[PDB]
Design an enzyme around this catalytic site. Structure first.
Site, mmCIF file in Angstrom:
data_model
loop_
_atom_site.group_PDB
_atom_site.id
_atom_site.type_symbol
_atom_site.label_atom_id
_atom_site.label_comp_id
_atom_site.label_asym_id
_atom_site.label_seq_id
_atom_site.Cartn_x
_atom_site.Cartn_y
_atom_site.Cartn_z
ATOM 1 N N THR A 1 0.818 -1.209 0.000
ATOM 2 C CA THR A 1 0.000 0.000 0.000
ATOM 3 C C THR A 1 0.857 1.266 0.000
ATOM 4 O OG1 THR A 1 -1.975 -1.003 0.984
ATOM 5 C CG2 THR A 1 -1.599 1.354 1.372
ATOM 6 N N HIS B 1 -7.084 -9.922 3.619
ATOM 7 C CA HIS B 1 -6.042 -10.583 4.399
ATOM 8 C C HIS B 1 -6.632 -11.693 5.267
ATOM 9 C CE1 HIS B 1 -2.523 -8.375 3.218
ATOM 10 N NE2 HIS B 1 -2.971 -7.202 3.632
ATOM 11 N N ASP C 1 -4.339 0.118 -5.388
ATOM 12 C CA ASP C 1 -2.892 0.150 -5.274
ATOM 13 C C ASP C 1 -2.239 -1.211 -5.378
ATOM 14 O OD1 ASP C 1 -4.128 -0.681 -2.982
ATOM 15 O OD2 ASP C 1 -2.920 0.616 -1.670
ATOM 16 N N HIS C 2 -2.961 -2.276 -5.047
ATOM 17 C CA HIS C 2 -2.383 -3.610 -5.025
ATOM 18 C C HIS C 2 -3.512 -4.628 -5.074
ATOM 19 C CE1 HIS C 2 -3.283 -3.776 -0.633
ATOM 20 N NE2 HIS C 2 -2.794 -2.549 -0.584
ATOM 21 N N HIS D 1 -0.008 -9.831 -0.066
ATOM 22 C CA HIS D 1 0.411 -9.171 -1.294
ATOM 23 C C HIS D 1 1.818 -8.623 -1.104
ATOM 24 C CE1 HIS D 1 -0.540 -5.231 0.612
ATOM 25 N NE2 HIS D 1 -1.517 -5.928 1.168
ATOM 26 N N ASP E 1 24.917 -0.016 -16.839
ATOM 27 C CA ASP E 1 24.284 0.559 -15.655
ATOM 28 C C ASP E 1 24.966 -0.023 -14.416
ATOM 29 O OD1 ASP E 1 22.607 2.222 -14.235
ATOM 30 O OD2 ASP E 1 20.911 0.834 -14.255
ATOM 31 N N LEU F 1 19.683 4.616 -15.634
ATOM 32 C CA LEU F 1 20.055 5.624 -16.613
ATOM 33 C C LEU F 1 21.353 5.233 -17.303
ATOM 34 C CD1 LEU F 1 19.275 8.839 -14.540
ATOM 35 C CD2 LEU F 1 17.720 7.313 -15.775
HETATM 36 C C1 LIG Z 1 12.451 8.817 -12.273
HETATM 37 O O1 LIG Z 1 12.275 10.208 -12.152
HETATM 38 C C2 LIG Z 1 13.208 10.837 -11.264
HETATM 39 C C3 LIG Z 1 12.827 12.298 -11.226
HETATM 40 O O2 LIG Z 1 12.770 12.840 -12.539
HETATM 41 C C4 LIG Z 1 14.641 10.604 -11.746
HETATM 42 O O3 LIG Z 1 15.532 11.058 -10.735
HETATM 43 C C5 LIG Z 1 16.260 12.188 -11.010
HETATM 44 O O4 LIG Z 1 17.420 11.782 -11.700
HETATM 45 C C6 LIG Z 1 18.140 12.880 -12.274
HETATM 46 C C7 LIG Z 1 19.260 12.285 -13.096
HETATM 47 O O5 LIG Z 1 20.086 11.434 -12.313
HETATM 48 C C8 LIG Z 1 18.634 13.805 -11.167
HETATM 49 O O6 LIG Z 1 19.235 14.945 -11.767
HETATM 50 C C9 LIG Z 1 20.426 15.570 -11.493
HETATM 51 O O7 LIG Z 1 20.356 16.271 -10.282
HETATM 52 C C10 LIG Z 1 21.650 16.561 -9.751
HETATM 53 C C11 LIG Z 1 21.480 17.164 -8.369
HETATM 54 O O8 LIG Z 1 21.014 16.144 -7.494
HETATM 55 C C12 LIG Z 1 22.393 17.493 -10.730
HETATM 56 O O9 LIG Z 1 23.658 16.936 -11.054
HETATM 57 C C13 LIG Z 1 21.573 17.733 -12.028
HETATM 58 O O10 LIG Z 1 20.561 18.711 -11.802
HETATM 59 C C14 LIG Z 1 20.983 16.445 -12.614
HETATM 60 O O11 LIG Z 1 19.951 16.838 -13.505
HETATM 61 C C15 LIG Z 1 17.478 14.250 -10.279
HETATM 62 O O12 LIG Z 1 17.983 14.938 -9.140
HETATM 63 C C16 LIG Z 1 16.648 13.053 -9.817
HETATM 64 N N1 LIG Z 1 15.465 13.504 -9.100
HETATM 65 C C17 LIG Z 1 14.751 12.719 -8.285
HETATM 66 C C18 LIG Z 1 13.561 13.359 -7.635
HETATM 67 O O13 LIG Z 1 15.051 11.546 -8.080
HETATM 68 C C19 LIG Z 1 14.904 9.126 -12.010
HETATM 69 O O14 LIG Z 1 16.161 8.963 -12.655
HETATM 70 C C20 LIG Z 1 13.809 8.531 -12.885
HETATM 71 N N2 LIG Z 1 14.017 7.103 -13.061
HETATM 72 C C21 LIG Z 1 14.231 6.538 -14.254
HETATM 73 C C22 LIG Z 1 14.430 5.053 -14.251
HETATM 74 O O15 LIG Z 1 14.260 7.196 -15.289
HETATM 75 C C1 LIG Z 2 -3.014 11.118 -5.101
HETATM 76 C C2 LIG Z 2 -3.094 9.598 -5.234
HETATM 77 C C3 LIG Z 2 -3.144 8.962 -3.845
HETATM 78 C C4 LIG Z 2 -4.571 9.027 -3.303
HETATM 79 C C5 LIG Z 2 -4.552 9.600 -1.887
HETATM 80 C C6 LIG Z 2 -3.921 8.597 -0.924
HETATM 81 C C7 LIG Z 2 -3.098 9.363 0.110
HETATM 82 C C8 LIG Z 2 -1.745 9.731 -0.497
HETATM 83 C C9 LIG Z 2 -0.751 8.619 -0.176
HETATM 84 C C10 LIG Z 2 0.085 8.755 0.834
HETATM 85 C C11 LIG Z 2 1.070 7.634 1.165
HETATM 86 C C12 LIG Z 2 0.718 7.005 2.516
HETATM 87 C C13 LIG Z 2 -0.660 6.343 2.479
HETATM 88 C C14 LIG Z 2 -1.695 7.184 3.230
HETATM 89 C C15 LIG Z 2 -2.348 6.360 4.339
HETATM 90 C C16 LIG Z 2 -2.694 4.967 3.818
HETATM 91 C C17 LIG Z 2 -4.065 4.549 4.341
HETATM 92 C C18 LIG Z 2 -4.200 3.033 4.232
HETATM 93 O O1 LIG Z 2 -5.182 2.558 3.766
HETATM 94 O O2 LIG Z 2 -3.157 2.217 4.690
HETATM 95 C C19 LIG Z 2 -3.495 0.870 4.842
HETATM 96 C C20 LIG Z 2 -2.234 0.019 4.742
HETATM 97 O O3 LIG Z 2 -1.378 0.341 5.804
HETATM 98 C C21 LIG Z 2 -2.610 -1.461 4.803
HETATM 99 O O4 LIG Z 2 -2.292 -2.076 3.584
HETATM 100 P P1 LIG Z 2 -1.128 -3.246 3.603
HETATM 101 O O5 LIG Z 2 -0.503 -3.328 4.977
HETATM 102 O O6 LIG Z 2 -0.068 -2.921 2.581
HETATM 103 O O7 LIG Z 2 -1.746 -4.588 3.282
HETATM 104 CA CA LIG Z 3 23.478 4.379 -14.692
HETATM 105 ZN ZN LIG Z 4 -4.005 -1.351 0.937
#
Ligand SMILES: *[C@@H]1O[C@H](CO)[C@@H](O[C@@H]2O[C@H](CO)[C@@H](O[C@@H]3O[C@H](CO)[C@@H](O)[C@H](O)[C@@H]3O)[C@H](O)[C@H]2NC(C)=O)[C@H](O)[C@H]1NC(C)=O
Ligand SMILES: CCCCCCCC/C=C/CCCCCCCC(=O)OC[C@@H](O)COP(=O)(O)O
Ligand SMILES: [Ca+2]
Ligand SMILES: [Zn+2]
Ligand SMILES: CC(C)CCC[C@@H](C)[C@H]1CC[C@H]2[C@@H]3[C@H](O)C=C4C[C@@H](O)CC[C@]4(C)[C@H]3CC[C@]12C
Ligand SMILES: [Ca+2]
Length: 778
Positions: free
Chosen positions: A156, A262, A305-306, A415, A658, A664
């Site tokens: 979840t 469950h 979610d699952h 799950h 990688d 990446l």
């Molecule tokens: C899934 O999405 C996330 C977010 O777009 C990707 O992570 C991001 O990865 C980039 C590239 O590695 C990071 O960017 C770099 O940031 C550093 C500073 O930390 C700087 O050298 C540059 O600004 C560069 O652009 C970025 O910070 C990072 N962000 C997050 C929130 O994770 C991730 O790679 C994606 N996954 C896949 C499989 O594509």
């Molecule tokens: C915007 C799309 C998301 C919809 C809004 C959901 C709230 C945003 C998500 C936040 C991340 C933390 C989850 C919030 C509280 C979760 C409430 C809940 O229902 O948890 C039950 C979970 O322990 C039991 O499931 P399992 O132990 O995994 O079997």
């Molecule tokens: Ca890499």
């Molecule tokens: Zn759940």
């Protein structure tokens, strides 16, 4: 008046520092005022009006009201108009297309209501309108898919935050319901106040993205004692707030049918009851939305979610049956296994001994150990410090635990398995103004919905792992239009520039049609050469000294020849590529651990004359002998098999680097192993993209409509310890290993910084849908 909740119940300006709070989260922080449960959680007379309650005199202590002035006060029971003003329930109204959002005056935008259900298996939707009338009409009226794929682990907390951020768990930080952050030296748990600290949470969730861009969100969260009906009435009451105080996005979550799933399992006869109660809550929301004259304006997302799988305690594997000592390790048990050292200072702890002691040690073993980098790249795990080095992928319907003592049947469903397992697939339904009318869409991953929801609110989404545009076919009108990534490095088209005498690579030898969808675009600074051959075309990187991609087409009728015994060790120099940027066999013959293979297999040549092109030094790649068992079976048996079943196939193959397992494309400084005494980098994986025409009646090279594609990212490993049956013939384990490492074209694009399918005759959104398709084999 300060100090108490009257006039402030579920106020959307909540804050601990000033006063006691009255919002929907005061319970979880244990900070409600003394009158909160008296004033804000009224439960008198229930949640349904009746014939005798019609036009009653206002009694403020009632849960919901059936008086005349409740429509103005905005707190009627959701069935007020149905039982008192002769209106009909929303589920009984015929399905009328919403060609345009019919919203009452004041609404800047159609409101977005997210309805989340825990543990809603995709199989549950087969119960129909008999059990869930409101849900099935949402599914038939709006937009739906046969199922929605969650992220691994299918739990979840990682999935609910993934739905809100669009990132894999590796990137938003919530990698499990339980986790240990060694930098914090603290433990995250489902229960407890540790989860409330913001340090655990990365990325930018939807409600923060909305808040930052001037779109009010309110409170997405609900304290667990607040009943479902009260949560619905709270959302409807917020919808009657003034214009500049009324949120635009709302979220409801339900803990069912996870709890009953469950206790009884996914197929228990007791499962019918909670699914009726969930549809009742859906009925209350839609009745209230119609009562508010918003049923043809609001967008509603019914999402899970699952899934849920049959799990009993009799099917629990114990590490104490495998490891000599289990007291020196901490294990995250359940449908997945994460193993770390139990003690900071324990140099007697070695992962190589534990992995070896867990690798194909017993027949009928119901788990498989992995170093997290060696997990299938489709899982997109590993790249997080909260993810332990040792991971156990647990077979469906099974548990793993450390000792039998930590185990003392309490549960019948669970799950968390691989996100490709059928029982883990969940549901998605989109109904509303912007959603399409009576339309079915292919299955998709939940990482893509964050872009859609921000698109539904005009928000610019924070960087995420969804492919924006791949879900454009879900909506009636799309404000977002995808952009094809422009080519960074332009290719060289080299002719013959050298003589065979110019080369001393120490290599022996005793002596369009193949690019169907345009050439791949290179999205980084490098230098590569386009090479044309009779049988294949390849983009040869002069930096990595090997092709980044190789494309060739095998017809349904194509024959499989064989290398003559005098040509098996034949490698020829490429007179079009400089010797400075060529590989040499002396590197391979001096590397006692490494052999070599070919990206285009010489077994599939159209003629013995054209076969000499396959033995070119520009078609070779470094491959361990144990991996050559997998690569040679794929090229000599499976490609011809795929071409026979699918009326020809176009194969694009190449390497993947990688070493830091972040998904990446690596740059030169991140390669940690070369061929011994060489500059030839060792790929960590090998990919292949196998494309045919969805209309199998047409050959691959003469296709008119949509395409059929499947890809894998085979890990380039020096042993076959992953496949316990690797002792036997390749027809008994290789295809199984490849099915384990299936992949989206998108995942290859991230790992190679390449762009495929650029000249296809299909729309780019349709192409973005193809590049996100995952062939699950289930
Ligand atoms: C899934 O999405 C996330 C977010 O777009 C990707 O992570 C991001 O990865 C980039 C590239 O590695 C990071 O960017 C770099 O940031 C550093 C500073 O930390 C700087 O050298 C540059 O600004 C560069 O652009 C970025 O910070 C990072 N962000 C997050 C929130 O994770 C991730 O790679 C994606 N996954 C896949 C499989 O594509
Ligand atoms: C915007 C799309 C998301 C919809 C809004 C959901 C709230 C945003 C998500 C936040 C991340 C933390 C989850 C919030 C509280 C979760 C409430 C809940 O229902 O948890 C039950 C979970 O322990 C039991 O499931 P399992 O132990 O995994 O079997
Ligand atoms: Ca890499
Ligand atoms: Zn759940
Ligand atoms: C009903 C309770 C037992 C469940 C606990 C709810 C918890 C998952 C929610 C409640 C408060 C949430 C944080 C808050 O909304 C602010 C943001 C800022 C954003 O940049 C990152 C996420 C974060 C910290 C929320 C995380 C989830 C929280 C803790
Ligand atoms: Ca083996």
């Amino acid at each position: 008046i300060s100090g108490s909740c009257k006039g402030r119940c579920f106020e959307l300006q909540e804050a601990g520092p000033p006063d006691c709070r009255c919002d929907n989260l005061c319970k979880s922080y244990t900070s409600c005022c003394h009158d909160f449960d008296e004033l804000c959680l009224k439960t008198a007379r229930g949640w349904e009006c009746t014939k005798d309650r019609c036009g009653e005199v206002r009694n403020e202590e009632n849960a919901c009201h059936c008086s005349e002035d409740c429509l103005a006060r905005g707190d009627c029971c959701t069935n007020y108009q149905v039982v008192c003003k002769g209106e009909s329930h929303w589920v009984d109204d015929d399905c009328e297309e919403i060609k345009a959002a019919e919203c009452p005056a004041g609404f800047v935008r159609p409101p977005l209501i997210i309805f989340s259900v825990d543990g809603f298996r995709a199989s549950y939707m087969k119960k129909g309108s008999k059990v869930m009338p409101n849900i099935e009409k949402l599914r038939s009226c709006g937009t739906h898919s046969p199922y929605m794929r969650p992220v691994y682990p299918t739990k979840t907390f990682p999935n609910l935050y993934t739905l809100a951020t669009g990132l894999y768990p590796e990137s938003h930080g919530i990698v499990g319901n339980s986790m240990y952050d060694p930098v914090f030296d603290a433990t995250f748990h489902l229960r407890g106040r540790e989860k409330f600290n913001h340090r655990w949470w990365g990325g930018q969730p939807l409600w923060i993205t909305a808040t930052k861009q001037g779109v009010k969100a309110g409170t997405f969260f609900w304290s667990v004692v607040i009943p479902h009906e009260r949560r619905i009435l709270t959302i409807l009451q917020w919808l009657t707030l003034p214009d500049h105080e009324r949120p635009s996005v709302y979220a409801f979550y339900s803990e069912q049918p996870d709890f009953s799933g469950h206790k009884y399992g996914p197929f228990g006869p007791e499962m019918t009851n909670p699914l009726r109660e969930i549809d009742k809550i859906v009925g209350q929301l839609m009745d209230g939305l119609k009562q508010l004259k918003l049923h043809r304006c609001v967008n509603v997302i019914f999402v899970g979610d699952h899934g849920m799988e049959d799990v009993t305690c009799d099917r629990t594997e114990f590490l104490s049956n495998y490891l000599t000592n289990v007291d020196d390790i901490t294990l995250v048990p359940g449908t997945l296994g994460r193993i770390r050292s139990k003690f900071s200072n324990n140099a007697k702890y070695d992962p190589k001994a534990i992995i070896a002691a867990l690798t194909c040690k017993k027949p009928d073993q119901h788990f498989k150990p992995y170093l997290k980098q060696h997990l299938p790249k489709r899982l997109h795990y590993a790249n997080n410090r909260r993810i332990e080095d040792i991971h156990l992928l647990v077979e469906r319907r099974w548990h793993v635990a450390r000792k039998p003592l930590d185990y003392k049947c309490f549960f019948q469903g669970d799950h968390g398995f691989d996100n490709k397992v059928n029982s883990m697939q969940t549901v998605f339904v989109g109904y509303g103004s912007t959603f399409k009318y009576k339309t079915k869409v292919p299955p998709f991953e939940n990482i893509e919905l964050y872009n859609v929801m921000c698109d539904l609110l005009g928000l610019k989404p924070a960087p995420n792992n969804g492919t924006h545009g791949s879900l454009n076919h879900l909506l009636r009108t799309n404000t977002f239009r995808p952009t094809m990534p422009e080519e960074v490095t332009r290719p060289n088209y080299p002719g013959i520039m050298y003589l065979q005498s110019d080369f001393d690579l120490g290599c022996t030898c005793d002596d369009e049609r193949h690019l169907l969808y345009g050439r791949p675009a290179v999205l980084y600074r490098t230098r590569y050469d386009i090479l044309y051959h009779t049988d294949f075309e390849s983009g040869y990187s002069e930096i990595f000294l090997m092709p980044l991609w190789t494309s060739y087409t095998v017809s349904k009728q194509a024959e499989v020849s064989s290398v003559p015994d005098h040509l098996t060790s034949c490698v020829r120099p490429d007179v079009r590529v400089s010797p400075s940027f060529s590989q040499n066999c002396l590197a391979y013959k001096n590397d006692k651990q490494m052999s070599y293979g070919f990206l285009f297999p010489p077994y599939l040549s159209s003629s013995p004359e054209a076969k000499y092109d396959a033995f070119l030094v520009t078609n070779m790649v470094p491959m361990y002998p144990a991996f050559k068992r997998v690569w040679n079976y794929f090229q000599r048996v499976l490609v011809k098999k795929y071409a026979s079943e699918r009326n020809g196939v176009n194969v694009i193959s190449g390497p993947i680097f990688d070493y830091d397992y972040d998904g990446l494309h690596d740059t030169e400084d991140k390669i940690k192993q070369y061929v011994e005494g060489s500059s030839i980098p060792v790929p960590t994986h090998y990919y292949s993209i196998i494309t045919s025409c969805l209309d199998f009646t047409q050959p691959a090279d003469k296709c008119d409509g949509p395409l059929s594609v499947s890809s894998f990212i085979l890990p380039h490993r020096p042993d076959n310890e992953e496949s316990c049956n690797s002792s036997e013939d390749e027809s008994k384990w290789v295809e199984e290993l490849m099915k384990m490492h299936t992949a989206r074209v998108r995942d290859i694009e991230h790992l190679t910084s390449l762009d495929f399918f650029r000249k296809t005759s299909r729309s780019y959104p349709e192409i973005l849908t193809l590049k996100t398709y995952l062939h699950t084999y289930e």
